[PDB]
Structure formats: C-alpha cells, structure tokens
Amino acid sequence: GALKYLEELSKKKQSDVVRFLLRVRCWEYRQLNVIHRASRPSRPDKARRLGYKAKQGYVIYRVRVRRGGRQLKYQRSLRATAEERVGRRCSNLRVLNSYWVNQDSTYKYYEVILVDPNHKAIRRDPRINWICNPVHKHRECRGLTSTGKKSRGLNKGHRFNKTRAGRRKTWKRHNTLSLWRYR
Amino acid sequence: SESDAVPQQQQQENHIRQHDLELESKPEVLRALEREATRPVEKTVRHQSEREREWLQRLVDKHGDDVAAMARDRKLNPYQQTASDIKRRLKKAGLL
C-alpha cells in the first residue's frame, strides 16, 4: 500500500521533503527541452489514479507552459495548452489525462498520459480500447479532457444552466423561432 | 386481523430463488405460448471430474463415513474442506 503514503505526501507540497525534491527537479527540467519524454511518471500515485498502467502503449511526456497572461484572460487553462502541444508532438497517440508536477515563477510543468491506439496490447484489452475508436481523435483539441470539462462548465445543478449540454447549443435552442403546422 | 399494523401482511400470499420465478374462450396464440412455457425441460445434470471421484474414494477408504475425521485429515484433505461440504460431495457421488 505504498500509493496511499504517496497520496498523503503530495498533500504536503510545502514540507521539507517535497519542496527540496520539487526544487532540484525544477532545475533538472529546465536543463532539458520544453517537451520531452519521461521514462516513468514522477508522481506514480497520481498517474495510476488517472489511468496509467505499465503496459506497452502507455507513455508519459513532460511539458512546460509559460505562465502569466496574454489584461486579457485565456478561457482555457495552462494544462489545456500543455495537452495540445504534447498531442501535436505525438500525433499518433491519444491524450488520456494530464497532471501537475512542478511550478516555477515562469513555467508551469505538467506530465501527460498517452495511449497508442494501434498497439495490439491496447486494442485487445477492454476498458481502454474505447480510445481506439475514431470519436476520440484529439480529445484535448475539442475539450474532452479533465481540464476541458471544467472549463466548459459541464456540471449538474442550477449554477450551470447556460453551460450544461453545450453553451452554444443551449443558446441556439433558446433563440430559434419554432413554428408548427397548426398555429 | 393484524396485531401489528403492517401493510405487507395484507399483500402476503430472507432468501428467494434467483434464476427463475415460482408461478402458479382465450386466443390460440396465448394457449400455444402457455404450453411452450410449461413444457418439461431436460435436466442436463452436472457430474464430477475423474480426479474428484478418486479424492472422495480415498477419503472413504481410510475414514469410512466419519466426515468429521476427513475434515481434520491433511494428507487426504490438502484444502481444509469442511465436513459439511465433504458430506455434500459424497451424496452427489453416490457413496455416503
């Protein structure tokens, strides 16, 4: 049960152990490229709860995104820009999810989970081969990742009236004139 | 009359059957469907494997019919099967 200990350790990001490790790894990532491949996840508890397996077809990619603003505010998060740049780099893979790893005063760092849809191990295995279907091409481009669902306001309740079932879809339904045959 | 005011005793006729239901001038199609539902069914009984029969045979050969002793045995009962479970397998096999 090592992953429950790892989950509680990531809760205390300001502690001596975690802040020391996040310091020496922030320097290490800046010595490398903006987008590069990680052999293993740096946060194995977080990747595993997001759907990572040590199988042939799962890869992990590290990415920096420049933090700040454009006084205009971008409507998607910096995690979304991190996912789209990795997906452009690996066009044959599918973006499953992504997670925060490090944060600087100039860059935000993320690690992206990718799945190969043409690997036989992925295709023969149910509970992952939904990503092989062509409806899941470039989920990060269309806002189907975890950060995409938060930005589009897809939550139940009276506090998300304009954003459930699509904002532009709900606006269009409210602005067509419906004329029947017997008026 | 109900001493306890419960509505369920009016409708009455913790384990139930799971895979089927116990049930108790008209069109011909409905009559044909009634005969097909109540037609007797072949049982397709389930037997035991060959190695299971020798394991039960060696158990009776050393202990007779004392199921409490075969449960406590270890060489002839490597999985600690309970005397109630072994007695059920014996009755299916044919030897008591």
């Binding site: 149910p126 509970r127 | 895979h19 409905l30």
Partner: peptide
C-alpha cells in the same frame, strides 16, 4: 468483453417472457 461482464451474462441473461391481457 471483460470476464466480469461474461459471468453476469452467463448466469443472468435476457429472458423470453410474455404478459397476459
């Protein structure tokens, strides 16, 4: 299919039934 799905369809499949009028 997953083998947990196959076990559920083996023991509880969709049945054939009718309702009288």
């Amino acid at each position: 299919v997953l083998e947990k799905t196959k076990k559920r369809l083996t023991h509880f499949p969709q049945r054939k039934y009718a309702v009288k009028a």
